[PDB]
Each structure stands twice: as C-alpha cells, then as structure tokens.
Amino acid sequence: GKKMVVALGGNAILSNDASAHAQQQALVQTSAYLVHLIKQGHRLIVSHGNGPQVGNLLLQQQAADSEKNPAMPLDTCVAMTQGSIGYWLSNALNQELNKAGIKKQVATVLTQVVVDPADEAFKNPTKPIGPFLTEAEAKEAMQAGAIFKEDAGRGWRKVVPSPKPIDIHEAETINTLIKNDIITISCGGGGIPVVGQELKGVEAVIDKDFASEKLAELVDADALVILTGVDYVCINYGKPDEKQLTNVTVAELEEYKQAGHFAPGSMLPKIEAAIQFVESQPNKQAIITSLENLGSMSGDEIVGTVV
Template sequence: MSPLADDTLVAVALGGNALLRRGEPQDAPTQLVNVRHAAAQIARLAHSHRLVVTHGNGPQVGLLALQGEAYPEVPPYPLDVLGAETEGMVGYLLEQEIANRLPAGRHVATLLTRVAVDRQDPAFQHPTKPIGPMFDRERAESLARDRGWTLVPDGTGLRRAVPSPRPQEVLALHATKALLDRGMVVICAGGGGVPVARTGPAGDYEGVEAVIDKDLAAALLARQLDAAMLVIATDVTAVFMDWGTAHARAIRRASPEALQALPLAAGSIAPKVEAACDFARATGNPAVIGSLDDIERLLCGQAGTWVSTGCSGLEFA
C-alpha cells in the first residue's frame, strides 16, 4: 500500500471520545486541549490532501441534555436541537484550531448539516447509541427509574442510550461539494448530522429525537463525495480480535467480509467496522480505523486496521 496521491479527497471521522476522552472532566478547557491535538493531526494531512472532516458528539450532547434539566422552568430541548448545538460548538473549535495551523489563504468552513433518516427505522424502538457521561450502577438505576432512560454498559460504567437510526441522505451535499471545490477544509455532519425526517411521503422535514451514528454518516458522506479514503480516527490503535482478553490481537488488514464476521461490541467498535466495510464495498477504496495520533501512518497502511476489498481474510499486526 502506497501513500495517496496529493490533492486526493480524504474523509476523516473523529470520534467523540477522541475529543473528550474517557474519564476526563467534560469541561471547556479539557475539550480545547484535545481539539488542539486533533487539529494538529488534521492540519498535517491538509497540506497535501483535500479534506472533509466529521466528528462525534456523544459526550457533548449528553452533557447538554443534563445541563438543560437543571432549569426545570423550560422543557428540555429535543436531541435534534442539541445535536445542532454541539455541531456548531465542536465545529467552531475545530475550525479555529485547524485554521490556526494552515498557511494564509487556506480556509476552513463548518457546515451545519441535516441528515435524513427513516421514521420507520427499528432503531427508534431499540435505543443503542451511548451519549453523555458514565454513571455507576446505583446512579444509572436511579436515572432509568426517574427519567425513563435506557442505560447500557460502556467501559467501567453505564451511559444513557438513545435511538440511532441509519442515515439515508446527507442534505447538505451540494454545499459541501461547493466548498471543497474552492479548496476549503470542510467540517460537516458533526455528530452524524442533525437528524430529520419527512412528515409524510413528500412532506416537509422536521427534527426527530435521535442521534445518528457519526461513523455511518461519515461513510455515507464519503461515498457520496467519492472520497479516495475514509479514515475513522478514534481512541484505540486498531480493531482487535478477542478485545479485553489476554489473547487480544490487533488486526492490521482485513476484507470487509472477514471483519464483519467477527463478534464485536454493539454501539462501540461495531458501527466503526460497519462504516468502514460499507465504504470499502461501495467504492472499492480503502477505509482505515485507528488512533488519531497515527493519522499519517493510517493513510499508508502502517498503523490501524486497513479495510479493503483487495484484502483477503484477516492479517494481524
């Protein structure tokens, strides 16, 4: 595998946990430190490639939901509005820090992005997407009882889970293409985009109570933009077989079929694998999953898990 040619379009999907890491305080200074680190990695790619960047918002949207409940005189804002707020918040921070690291004349634009979903998606009946902070079991049981939340295991604790319908269409695609054609680094579809659905077969769009998986949205966006590669940058170095055991092995290269045949944690690495495999199968171009710190090596197949239809089975690091 050789490095991509200069000026090719690369889609980079930043995980929410790459911006607010597990166990860290969810305050503005901590997030800014992590955003600056992410921006430094992305800016290095921007010197030789056209870039579209997406990002997660799970920790941020969950925190906003909790903050909103501290003022009971106003009903809590719905998740689509909170998603738009976090898309603007994280997008602003990324835009500023990436722009600070680019030469004069190279611009960055953040695009508020609606993403259409299907109201009949079964995900609305089975919440699986973790958002917000982790709780211990006693606090989680209290939240489930008092607020009707669904709580799911994540790491050493439990987190609120909300519906995560599959993205159907990126509604800002033409605007994204126009900005890319002008040579801008584009930040869009943050948090999977703002979830909207039609009111009827040909009705208007309106927001829905959900959080779209940002990796699946990034894969859809990358396919529609004909990106040469999808990079899913997260807080783990690769996809592992037998994760969490003494026999864990990092997968260096994989075919989509072999990778998706593995038992993987739903709501965690599984959506990243699904997104990478969808992109690789649909385009014939590679996707890679790995650490943000290794971003340049990810593009060369020297780090992370490289997913390609040109691979056969699984190859371990």
Template sequence: MRVVIALGGNALLKRGEPMTADMQRQNIRIAAEAIAPIAAEHQIVITHGNGPQVGLLALQGAAYKPDEAYPLDVLGAETEGMIGYMLEQELGNLLPFEVPFATLLTMVEVDGSDPAFRHPTKFVGPVYEADEAAKIHQDKGWFFKQDGNKWRRVVPSPLPKRIFEIRPIRWLLEKGTIVICAGGGGIPTMYEPDKERTLVGVEAVIDKDLCSALLARELSADLLIMATDAEAVFTDWGTAEQKAIFKSNPEKLGTYSFPAGSMGPKVEAACHFARQTGQTAAIGALQDIAAILNAERGTIINSSFPDMTWHKPDRVPR
C-alpha cells in the first residue's frame, strides 16, 4: 500500500517540553520506531508539524532589525530541512542500509484572496503569559490568541491549492524511497497578481492536516494516517460520557463537532480525503501506527462503512 503518515506535533515536541535539539531528537526517535516496522511492506510518505520550530526561529530572528528578520516561508523551509534530517537519520538507524530516504522542501500554492489572511488563526511558537503576549504584540505587532491557559502567536492559515513538487515525490516513491515532504503544511507560496509565473513566499502557515490530505489525494494513496497523542477520535471528550469512535463513514463523523485547535482539522481533513477518494483515512496514536494500518486501533474512516461503531472501553484507555 501507499501510505501517507502525518505526524502530529507530539512527534516532535510535547507541550511544556524545552525546544532543544536533544528533546526533538528523542521524540523523533519514538516516531521512527513506530514507522520502521511497516516500511518494509509499504510505500511510505511522511509529513510533520513545525509550529514550535518556526516559532523558535522567529524568536531568534527577533534579534535582527524588523526589516532584516526572515519571513515565515523561509523559516518553514529551514524547519523542513532540519526535521527531515532528523527523521532520515533516526529511520536510517533502524532500517536496512540500502533503504533510500529523501527530504523535499515542498512549496504549496495558496490564494492571495483567501479569507484566512484577514483572520489569523494558526498557532506558532511557544506559549506566553497574558502580560508577556501583550507586550510582544505592542513591540512587534504579532497577533495572539488564548491556547489553554496560555497565549500563543497566530498567523494566517490559507487553504492549500497545489503541491509543486508532486512529480518528484511520485518519482521517488516509484524507486522505493521513503519520502519526507510537506512539513508544516508546506512552504506557503503564491503567484504575484498581474505577474505571470512570478512565485513569491507568503507570511502564513498552511494547516498540515489539510495539506497532508491534499498530498495523499494527489499521490493516489491507499491510506492516510494522522498520528497524534490521542488513541482515537472521542465524542464528549473530557467528560464521563466520552467514547472512542472505531469506524465511521465521513458523513456520519462530519455531524459531530470537534475542537478547532486540535482534533477538528484532523477530522475535517480525514473526512475530505475519504469522501473524495473512496480510500481510507485514520486518526490515532503514534505508537499504534502498525495496528491502525491493520484497522485494529484508532478511528478508521471510509465511505463504505454503513454507520459508526465504537471501541470497547478496554480497547482504548481513557
């Protein structure tokens, strides 16, 4: 099978952990250990988040004068290379020497008229106390929104339209390469108005789940797995009535509401992929990737399922 695996932020940096290279490598090693066992039998494409990493580079860039700081598209390209390097190395330490890897800096086209540019919503960078966020807003003009009991910077998150490197990704897969691409939703780019074929970077961050779904669709993937820190998609999360969804068609799953800052985009992207392609999408825990691939764990989404079924309480711990 051709499998696209979208690694959630927990695969790189958990909330509250220091943004050090050693900590990121420890988490990436865990992701590699989950992916390696299935790589021998399947074509694998890996995408990943990069919000904390982009935020860290933006903070480092704050040492420059405002007109010297690197824009978000360049920072996104930097993090794609950094994270791809670590993933390649940790996977390479587990898989046979002859298995090839490739990390592609991936440009993704967005629409300059996308309403997201008027309403920034995408979290990037570390969390702040309210007074600290207010000061940074005053000093640098950054926009902030509440994330839990802290505050984080938000930037525009336009919809992905096209993945420019889709052809080389296909070529690499045909040669048996494990491909790491579209990190952080890809590098946001667009054509300048009234300038034919003039591509420029955009100060934005594309949602990685929606981009992963677009990538999986354009690659004709058999399965899209969104690996996160939750064992499945839960209804009534955080309450005594919470239940873990096992299997569902996208129409039924789409009738439920999930938090916009966490599970919501994953469910939306998974349903979109399953509905458009007739293939399977899944959402579940990183350590369960092999079982998710066998439709034994996580939440499995396919249009052929007649209704929604639930995990037994002892199958998915609360």
C-alpha cells in the first residue's frame, strides 16, 4: 500500500527516564503503533531523531576527555546514536511483529546525509541538544566554547547547527531494501552530517523532519508522517480562536504561517517540511498527528495537500 516515512522523535523516545531500559521500553509501545500500520498493508520507512541521546553521549565524551580516551566529535557521536537507537527500535519492532504474527524483516542502515558547508546554520547553532541546565551551569559550560539557549520553563540546553539535507548517500541501498519488502530504519539522528564529494564529516545535527522529507523524495514515498504529541494542529491554542486544522491546503498553511501562527521552535519546522514535501511531486501528501492516533487509523488528522 502507501509508502509512509515516519519520523520518530528523540525527545519522545527519551521523554522522561534517560536509562537505556526506559527508552527501549518506550519504543515497545511506539512499535505497537507502527506495526498497526503494517497490519493495514502500508509500507513503513522509519526514521528518528536523537536530540537528548546525542547530548548525553556528548557529555560522556567530555567527562573522560584525554589523550588515552579522546572525545568523539559530534559527527561520530551521531553515528553512535544511529547504532544505539537503531538497535533499540529494531529490537522493539521485531518483538511487536513477532507477537502480531507478521513476518517482515527490519534493518537499520547507517546514513550519511550531505549538507552545504555554506549553510547559515553553521553560524546559527539552534538544535537543542542534551539535558536542561540551570543558567549557572550553562555559564560554566558556555565559556568552554559552547552556545546555549533558554526554554522558558525548564532551563537551558546546548545548541548546535542544523544544516538542511541536500542528499542522502545511502539512498540507493535504502530504496533497494524497500523494494525487497524490508522495514528500513535510516537517517538516524537526522543522518551523519557530511560535506563535499569526499563526504567529509562536520560537526552538526540535522533535523529528523527535514531529513525524513528528503528521504521521502529520493524514495518516492506516498506520504510523509510528522509526529506530534496531539492529533491535529491547533492554532490560537488557549485563546477563544482555538481551531483544529484537519484538512488543509498548502496555501492555507502559508496563510497561517505568514500570520505567525507557528512557533519557530517546534511547529514551524513541521509545517515547512510538510509543505516542502507536498510541493515536490504531484500526488504526494503530508500528515501531522500523534503516533497514538496512527495506532488507531481510519480517516486521519492534518492532511496537507495541493493537486
């Protein structure tokens, strides 16, 4: 059936307890929802972020930094998160598929995503990475050669550059796996940031949503699934103008966008990615909803289109 690229959130995987067990445990539930789509005859093309995971790992790299045990640069850290999270997800999916009696194979592929070295993002570190720190701790680490930004309500986090995806090196192999009916997990953590023909690794963390967006293109998927904690995109939330979006046209999204309805932090990137995907090919669509909502399915939430 429909080829769907689902982008799992790293902050969702690690929304509370930061222990491997807790994260794997969380992935069991998400896998249950994913397998549900498989029961419906859809083709799953899974991806995932790594925000908190990579930050914690980066800290671990710094904690023992020495000649004998040197810290692995961010690009290499992303690769490690592809391994860890990949492992967890794949194990979870297998468990759920096995239980559901469905016999599909799952494979995670290390993905190197090319980016433009002249990307403005390299000047503007924005990707919130790791745990929340007090302004005090933020200062303590800030002077070590790092930039932090505040999230009103919980604290400060280290910000990193998030360049836009230009090309997915392993795209061909991924596509081949898809053609052989294998559930693929790729573009882990937005993909290992790489630049140039030599694919020189750079220090950054790409946004899962935009990486998934490119994958959807190169893979010619039918739908791009952007995850959110709530089903339906709300506008003017606490205000008396509260409205769900349900069925929307790209033009309609642009209207709301121009009217500053989407927060630059989370919602804006979601909308932009959605719009970009739909505008890439004639018969394509983007969906924005809760994974739990997909676990139910019938007539789903937020469908961005133009045709």
